[PDB]
Amino acid sequence: PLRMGGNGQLQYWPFSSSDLYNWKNNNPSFSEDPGKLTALIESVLTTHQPTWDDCQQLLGTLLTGEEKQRVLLEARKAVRGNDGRPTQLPNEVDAAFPLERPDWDYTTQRGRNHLVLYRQLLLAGMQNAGRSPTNLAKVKGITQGPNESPSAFLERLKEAYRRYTPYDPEDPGQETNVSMSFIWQSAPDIGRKLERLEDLKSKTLGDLVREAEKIFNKRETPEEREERIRRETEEK
Amino acid sequence: EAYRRYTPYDPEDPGQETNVSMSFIWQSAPDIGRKLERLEDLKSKTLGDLVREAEKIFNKRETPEEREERIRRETEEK
Amino acid sequence: PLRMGGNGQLQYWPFSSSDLYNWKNNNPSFSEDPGKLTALIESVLTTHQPTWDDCQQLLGTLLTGEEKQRVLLEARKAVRGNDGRPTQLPNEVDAAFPLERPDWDYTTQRGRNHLVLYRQLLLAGMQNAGRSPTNLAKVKGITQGPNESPSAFLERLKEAYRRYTPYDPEDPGQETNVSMSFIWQSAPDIGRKLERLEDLKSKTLGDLVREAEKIFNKRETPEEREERIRRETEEK
Amino acid sequence: EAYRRYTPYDPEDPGQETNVSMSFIWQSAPDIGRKLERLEDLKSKTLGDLVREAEKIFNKRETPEEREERIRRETEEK
Amino acid sequence: RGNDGRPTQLPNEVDAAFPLERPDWDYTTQRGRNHLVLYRQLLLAGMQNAGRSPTNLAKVKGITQGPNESPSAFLERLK
């Protein structure tokens, strides 16, 4: 880690192994749920200002050999030339994201800039490495749970679009597509009512969530239902 | 036809293409849908592309006669 | 450990025993899997900038008596004379990798250079000691498991090359060699398809892994298979 | 050779190519013939093309040893 | 190749270098000899390029030393 010392100069100290192992032990593996470790590492990359060696310890400790490899190749694939476009030119790729220890000196603006870029690319690598290619079945498999709010369900549905399709669920051109999955895969009472909405074509995704909440928010409390039953007085 | 009759969305609109495409993939016959889902650069496939890819699988129907012949020539007993 | 202080001067502090014991407890023994501790120590040698005494604590804590001995003799065998060749001259060996506390002063360029070299040789020692006499049968014995991903299998295969051969599986000159083992020892369905690839000679190790993943990723779910069987409707 | 010996047609004549091609497809081994028949743009295939396509199938012979190994690893009992 | 060292599909050039019908090349003349040299060179090139034998790694893995087979004989079959 690096921090600005009291004398206006960067100061280095190695990661405590307790931090590294705590981060590992309090999160799922990268493969299980890439978002967890990616968010943790994104944070640490900022607060701990790791050097290249520090990043090797992070990756080496939190990822398996196969995960780290995926991340490193993904990071190198994220390198851009001075024209802002991808580049596979060995010298450019190596200069941005070196696989072997670089001579970056954190006391120099040159060293610092490389470190900044390295960390940015590392993050990109992790973000991209966490992609279950395309698998539409995963999107169709997101079904609202019986206690799950419509907004929570929609967020899980969008997460599946992100992970398992090439479509961005936040794109304006995807709205009807996400809307149809939302209606079809909502809890059955909700989906049947959303399907019956007047001027359904006119409903935004936000509108549909609000309409589903009205039904959900009409959950008819268990206690209430039980009370009704008791006061049923209809015998057989 | 179902989009036309039972939704306000025109399935021929350019803005509906991904929507119709997703229904097409999801509701195709299971062998076809599983293969369309696995297409490389799926995001880049038009509705016309998806139909052509599905036809390749369908057109690989593996004739009933052919299948039966294979079974006969199976020679694997139990 | 040493770090550059806020005053531009190296600053020393002893290892926290919690770090040493955490490193030990979160890894296999050196004998079980030398790569684990070797990678951890390689990292620490950089981030913690250990002195000679610090290195003795590292080794003393993470390795058994027999492992440490192997490593130390391997490190001394890695010493090079000024002509870049191996040397068994006692004075040269002792000067580079002393078995007893040296008078190295980290506040001097002389002391620092010796420390750098010492750490480099220590790493070399570990890398070579983790070199279980050459045993090609161990490499041929790495076979992809029925649930094992191609990338996970390749990492195990590379680990066997490292431990049981003198060949570095990451060398460009070893690529076809590792590729052939990868094809031959992949799961049978995968190996048969990789063998049939068009322009096979042109496939990199990375290409082969991606092609194997396409087959693996076509795993044909157990549920799916069962469903197919049920819908079989072919009786006897 | 059979065309030469037992017909008046020269199998190397450009005007005989489709004729020889059809015999080649029809009289190839059954697995090969069925696949050649299914080739896309079959009309466009020369005799040389057809031979190369048949070689791809033949060259996919699925070694006896390989087949046996598969069977052994079958683990499906009856 | 044409005189500019590049490929050519010009019938007259192709025919002149590698004729499909008997040419009038006279081996007692430097002209005839040079054409013969070129013809042979092109014939070799043709064979080299027509080659391109389909790959099949299973065939290489299938070469196993026989119980009576000497190591050098086995190595030659493997090669």
Numbering used by the authors:
A (entry chain D), C (entry chain B): 1 to 236
B (entry chain C), D (entry chain A): 159 to 236
E (entry chain A): 80 to 158
Paper passage:
Murine leukemia virus (MLV), the prototypic member of the γ-retroviruses, is commonly used in comparative studies and as a basis for retroviral vector design. The CA domain and immediate downstream residues mediate protein interactions in the immature shell, and, following proteolytic cleavage, CA forms the mature viral capsid. In this study, we have determined the structure of the truncated MLV CA-CTD by X-ray crystallography and have resolved the architecture and CA lattice structures of immature and mature MLV particles by cryo-ET and subtomogram averaging.
We identified 1,299 pentamerically coordinated positions from the 134 virions in our dataset, extracted subtomograms at these positions, and iteratively aligned and averaged them to generate a structure of the mature MLV CA pentamer at a resolution of 8.6 Å. CA domains were fitted into the map as rigid bodies. The CA-CTD layer displays high curvature at the pentamer positions, and the CA-NTD pentamer protrudes further outward from the CA-CTD layer than in the hexamer. Comparison of the interfaces between neighboring CA molecules in the pentamer and hexamer revealed subtle differences in these interactions but no dramatic opening of the interdomain cleft as we previously observed in the HIV-1 pentamer. The MLV CA-NTD pentamer is more tightly packed around the fivefold symmetry axis than the hexamer, resulting in an even narrower pore in the center and higher local positively charged electric potential contributed by arginines in the β-hairpin. Within spiral or nested cores, more than 12 pentamers are required to accommodate the increased total curvature, and we observed as many as 24 pentamers within a single virus particle. As the total curvature of a multilayered structure is greater than that in a sphere, more than 12 pentamers are present in MLV particles. The presence of pentamers, rather than gaps as in the immature lattice, suggests that having a CA lattice without holes may be important during early stages of the MLV lifecycle.
